[PDB]
Design an enzyme around this catalytic site. Structure first.
Site, short mmCIF file in Angstrom:
data_model
loop_
_atom_site.label_atom_id
_atom_site.label_comp_id
_atom_site.label_asym_id
_atom_site.label_seq_id
_atom_site.Cartn_x
_atom_site.Cartn_y
_atom_site.Cartn_z
N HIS A 41 0.66 -1.20 -0.15
CA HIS A 41 -0.18 -0.37 -0.19
C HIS A 41 0.68 0.98 -0.14
CE1 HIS A 41 0.46 1.19 3.93
NE2 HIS A 41 -0.37 -0.12 4.80
N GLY A 143 2.69 6.25 10.12
CA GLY A 143 4.18 6.07 9.44
C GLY A 143 4.60 4.46 10.26
N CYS A 145 3.58 1.39 9.66
CA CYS A 145 3.53 0.05 8.43
C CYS A 145 4.78 -0.07 8.40
CB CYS A 145 2.80 0.66 7.11
SG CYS A 145 1.38 0.92 7.35
#
Ligand code: QFL
Ligand code: QFL
Lengths: 305, 305
Positions: A41, A143, A145
């Site tokens: 993503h 942030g 991820c």
């Protein structure tokens, strides 16, 4: 003496954390050998997340659209490909800090350490369990991820989790390092919810053995139970079923403390039906389920890495 | 979202852990630049421990009596000196992995990460707090002496604790990295006991603000309190006095949530009176006191839910 929620030493994983930037989105990547792994993503806008076609979004990106920063050094991306929900960015430089590693998919109840990162920089390390509902009760902000979960067995880091998203109840969802989600989740901004969770029974029993090893015995009793009667009580209190495999795994702890597994089950039944009566076990008023039998043995024996 | 007992990533400290041996005793050392710091009791036998004269024991040692092993490499000791309860062994190699560091002496209530080690090898990392009675509730077995406590705000490691001993209640005593013990403890086997432990009030308040930031307000009430009336009540539950310094330190959290410090004190008073009534706060059925105001700000979102 003492019993803490202990994570593995994170140094071997810290040397693999990088920052991956694609357009306006920045997240974390795991750099092992000449590949940087990160959530797919990273290529999406907030609009794309509503219904993304990752292959179509990815074909529009070139290698130079991916900015990978390892400390204060920019790595050059020389290839990109997708494997399930993970993007693999081939870089020109093999990570000289790559530890001995494996990608392992864990089962609910298994614990692991999470190295929370922001902008490719490690911020903290904590221990958590894969819940029976396949979520993790992590501690992550925007942030985070691409932050990873891992275990260490001997000198080999077993990467088992990569952070992808936070669900509406504040719990977290992610994948193994091959990009397969844990649980029935998808990487799309759509209505998703964690199912009803249960307590990891074998882990509560392991923690009760840890309490006994640490001198907390108030909850012990003279009684025993059958596996079927204990499982009927576990079902009633939203506890996972205890299998003969769980009983076998608790064997060493049972031998060390002299408390048979079904004898500890009768203690657990009594705690479930009566509560703690104002008492605590290992500094907790709740039955702790995020220590496996292996974690208890490891912490009570001082295994090093 | 989420709130975990989070430790700093331990990699910067793992690269400093070495094994120190003097005769039959083996423990851990911290290798920074060309000096290895370790508990001075490494020169003692179990017999020497009732009334050791460290000056007399140390004068009988030469540099070659100290065996220092960094991984699978023996370091050569070229000097030794004692500073309070720490032994400083000068070695002929500066640690190439020495991070940016400082030695800081902390106050009760302060938290830190502990990298538990055995034989110079890291075993685990956990978060700790210096109790008001100057002990730490660690998780340490025999061989853990010399393991250190630290904080890593930015890329600088602030070493604040070195493990020396376990007290009869299972709690732990140690020194700062200048060898000064925290608390009225000595590195002697004479009868010593921790003072009555108390709850770190400012930390419980910080953790209540963490709960409000994360979306929970069930425990709030329509009342406020004076600082003195709060302290009169809190002391009855064995809580540390809350000072004007603590009220000032909680200012930023008070501004972010909109709940005045004395308004949160009133909530705490009611929680002590009522208990949780089957509810939890941030996954805990007890009032947590091992998160400081600074830890809450570092971990929590800057935007309240
Ligand atoms: O959840 C997402 C973005 C995302 C990913 C996949 C998806 F399907 C939709 C949205 N990121 C976050 C991860 N963890 C903690 C977070 C706390 C706050 C905000 C964002 C967080
Ligand atoms: O306490 C000592 C040795 C010692 C040091 C100084 C002193 F004056 C007396 C004894 N070691 C240990 C440290 N931590 C956890 C331990 C668990 C179990 C056993 C030993 C542990």
């Amino acid at each position: 003496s003492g019993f803490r929620k202990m994570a593995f030493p994170s140094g071997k994983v810290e040397g693999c954390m990088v920052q991956v930037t694609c357009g306006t989105t920045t997240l974390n990547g795991l750099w092992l050998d000449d590949v940087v792994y990160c959530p797919r993503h990273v290529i999406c806008t907030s609009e794309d997340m509503l219904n993304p076609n990752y292959e179509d979004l990815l074909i529009r990106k070139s290698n130079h659209n991916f900015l990978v920063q390892a400390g204060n050094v920019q790595l050059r991306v020389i290839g990109h490909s997708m494997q399930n929900c993970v993007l693999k960015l081939k870089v020109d430089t093999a990570n000289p800090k790559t530890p001995k590693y494996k990608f392992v998919r864990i089962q609910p109840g298994q614990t692991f350490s999470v190295l929370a990162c922001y902008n490719g920089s490690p911020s903290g390390v904590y221990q958590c369990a894969m819940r029976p509902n396949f979520t993790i009760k992590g501690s992550f902000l925007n942030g985070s991820c691409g932050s990873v979960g891992f275990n260490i067995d001997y000198d080999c880091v077993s990467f088992c989790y990569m952070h992808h998203m936070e669900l509406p109840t504040g719990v977290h969802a992610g994948t193994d390092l091959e990009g397969n989600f844990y649980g029935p989740f998808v990487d799309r901004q759509t209505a998703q919810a964690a199912g009803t969770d249960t307590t990891i029974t074998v882990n509560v029993l392991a923690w009760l053995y840890a309490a006994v090893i640490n001198g907390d015995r108030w909850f012990l009793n003279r009684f025993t139970t059958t596996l079927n009667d204990f499982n009927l009580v576990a079902m009633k209190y939203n506890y996972e079923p205890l299998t003969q495999d769980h009983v076998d795994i608790l064997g060493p702890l049972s031998a060390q403390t002299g408390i048979a597994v079904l004898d500890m089950c009768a203690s657990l039944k009594e705690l479930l039906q009566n509560g703690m009566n104002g008492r605590t076990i290992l500094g907790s008023a709740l039955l702790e389920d995020e220590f496996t039998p292996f974690d208890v043995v490891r912490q009570c024996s001082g295994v090093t890495f």
